[PDB]
Amino acid sequence: LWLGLRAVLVVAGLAVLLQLIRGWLSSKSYVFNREEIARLAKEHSGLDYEVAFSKIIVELRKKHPGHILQDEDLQWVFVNAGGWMGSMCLLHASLTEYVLLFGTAVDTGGHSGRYWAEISDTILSGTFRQWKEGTTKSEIFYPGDTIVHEVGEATSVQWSSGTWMVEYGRGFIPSTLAFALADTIFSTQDFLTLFYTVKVYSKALLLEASTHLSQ
Template sequence: MGYKIDPDVLASVAKQVVGEGLAGNELITRTTQLLAEAYPDLIDAAPGRWVGSKAGGILGKVRFLYFSPREYVVLFGTPTGTQGFSGRYKHVDIHKFLIAGQIDWYNLESDDLTAMTLRPGEHTHTERGHARGMTIHPGSWHVEYGRGAVATTLPFAMVDTLLVSLEVESVRRSAVEFTKLVRRRLRR
């Protein structure tokens, strides 16, 4: 069974949105619209609910757009900035397509001691088993795409929020959003 989402299509959407020069809610609305046009059977253009997320110390807002056992697409960002650990997913590749702001990152195990910078319209790919330190600058928003055994990402995505921050409501809201996406897929 193949994958349904093409990273090249996501990159094209990110570049188009950046080229339109939008900001704030217009940026998010337009990005969601273009993704829904590219994948009408997978992504709903109706605005979803923002959910607080803290994983690896990175605190931000996430909007779930698509979720399956093998893939997911979310919008993630922060109006104020954040930094932390990307997570190390042994069974999932993570792609980020920046639509606003800036992300600085470095590979944790590399001999290279310099940081890399991701700018709007650019894409980065964290391969399975690798991890990064990251600084997400204020006003940064990106489309994130995960490909692989998606369920293996959930403990990292939820444990920090629940056990460190004791933020039960965000975990509950995330579960509600996941359930909506799964139900939508089952109806098709």
């Protein structure tokens, strides 16, 4: 039964880690909230998305100091996943939450991805077409609306050539990195972008670790 030792060790490891992480998510104090980020974006969902980005980043650093990356650690990184292409401006990220500014300047679309995280996007500009699984009709969302991509749900997304939004996710963030980097490995082969994504995600983790040490 020695050959089965490896198979038992992974099943026991996955079952223990599944209860360890799920019990952590149900007992962890969270920094941001899905309604908090959506409300913040709706305050400026009339202005220019560049003007909205500035006022949103300023308001986030006031209400949650020590949790948003500095302007020195901010950069627009391309994101290739599920067949669509966009760019992100990661403001905050931990092992359980993340807040970023996502959007695209071209017409893209594809698979939303199925992972262990609840994702909410509040559109600031452009349009957002969503196709839920098992249906034959899609819905188009406009600036001001908030789309909630629930955990375990898989939909089809599509954006116009000027769509920008504010996004908040909660769950187990590392579970999404397999889907977020799939097209970067097998399609674009833009390993420099792969480096940028790990770079800014590590800075957000080190910043979050630095805040817990001071408290």
